[PDB]
C-alpha cells in the first residue's frame, strides 16, 4: 500500500478495522457522536 510490508511489518491493509466492532458489524457507544460532527 503506502508502506512496504517487508519493513513495515503486517497490519497496513487491514488497519483501523476493529476485530470486535467493524469486523463484526458492531459500533461502539459513542462513535455516532463523531459521525454527527462530520455532518
Amino acid at each position: 500500500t503506502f508502506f512496504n510490508e517487508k519493513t513495515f511489518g503486517l497490519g497496513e491493509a487491514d488497519c483501523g478495522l476493529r476485530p470486535l466492532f467493524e469486523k463484526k458489524s458492531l459500533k461502539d457507544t459513542t462513535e455516532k457522536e463523531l459521525l454527527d460532527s462530520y455532518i
Binding site: 503506502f2 508502506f3 511489518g9 470486535l20 457507544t29 459513542t30 457522536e33
Partner: protein
C-alpha cells in the same frame, strides 16, 4: 483522561502503554501502526527538563490492555524526529519505537491507520470530533483502572493560537470544548504520546490524526490540548521505516 469514560473492550486495540522498565512506572501512551512499529511523542522519550532521556533499555510497552492475552514487548530501537528540539516549542513532537519482535494481532491488538492527503483534508476540520484514549490521570492532580476515552472537537487555528502564548506551528493542531460548551474533557499527564483518532465516514477505518503533545493544565476551560499533526510528518515516518524496518 479528564471528564472521560470507561472504554469498552477492544474499542481501541491500537492503544499502547509506555512503561519505565522497573523502576516500573507508566510514562506515556502510544499507538500500534503495525505489528512492529509503535508511534508516540518525542517528549516521552527525550525531555531533559522533566529529566527524561531513555534508551531502548530503559523502556517497555504493554499492548492489548483493557483493565489494570495482553503482551509486554521490549524495544529494538527508538527514533526521535531529527528536527525535534525540546529546547524550544515541542514542534515535531513525534517518535517511533521498533519492537524487538513482532506482536501478534488479536481482538484487543490491532493497528490504527495513518492518514492520507484526502483523509486529512476532509476530516481534520474545526468542529469535527476525534477521540483520545489513555491511562492518564483522571484528575488534573489519581489514575484509572480501565482505559479511558473522550471525544474532542478540533478547534479553529486562530482560536488555538489566541488561547496560548506559545507559538503554534503547522505541525500542531488543538482540540477541546469551548468555555461555553456544556461538555468538558481533555487529555492529561500520562496521556501524552497517546493517539487522537477519527473514524472515516467513507471507509469506516480509524485513522490517527494526532499524538497528544502538551496542554496548559488539564481540562482548563478557555485552554486547549495540542497535538502533533501526524500527517505532516508522515514523510519522516516513511523514511525511518524504510531505512530501519
Amino acid at each position: 483522561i479528564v471528564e472521560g469514560w470507561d472504554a469498552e473492550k477492544g474499542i481501541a486495540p491500537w492503544q499502547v502503554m509506555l512503561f519505565r522498565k522497573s523502576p516500573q512506572e507508566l510514562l506515556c501512551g502510544a499507538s500500534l501502526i503495525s505489528d512492529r512499529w509503535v508511534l508516540t511523542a518525542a517528549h516521552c522519550i527525550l525531555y531533559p527538563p522533566w529529566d527524561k532521556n531513555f534508551t531502548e533499555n530503559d523502556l517497555l510497552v504493554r499492548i492489548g490492555k483493557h483493565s489494570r492475552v495482553e503482551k509486554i514487548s521490549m524495544l529494538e530501537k527508538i527514533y526521535v524526529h531529527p528536527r525535534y528540539n525540546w529546547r524550544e516549542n515541542l514542534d515535531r513532537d513525534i517518535a517511533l519505537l521498533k519492537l524487538k519482535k513482532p506482536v501478534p494481532f488479536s481482538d484487543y491488538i490491532h493497528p490504527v491507520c495513518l492518514p492520507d492527503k484526502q483523509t486529512v483534508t476532509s476530516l481534520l476540520r474545526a468542529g469535527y470530533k476525534g477521540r483520545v484514549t489513555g491511562w492518564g490521570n483522571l484528575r488534573e492532580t489519581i489514575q484509572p483502572s480501565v482505559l479511558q476515552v473522550v471525544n474532542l472537537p478540533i478547534v479553529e487555528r486562530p482560536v488555538c493560537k489566541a488561547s496560548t502564548r506559545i507559538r503554534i506551528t503547522d505541525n500542531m493542531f488543538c482540540a477541546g470544548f469551548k468555555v461555553n460548551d456544556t461538555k468538558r474533557g481533555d487529555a492529561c499527564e500520562g496521556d501524552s504520546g497517546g493517539p487522537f483518532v477519527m473514524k472515516s465516514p467513507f471507509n469506516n477505518r480509524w485513522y490517527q490524526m494526532g499524538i497528544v503533545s502538551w496542554g496548559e493544565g488539564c481540562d482548563r476551560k478557555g485552554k486547549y490540548g495540542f497535538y502533533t499533526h501526524v500527517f505532516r510528518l508522515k514523510a519522516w515516518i516513511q523514511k525511518v521505516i524504510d531505512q530501519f524496518g
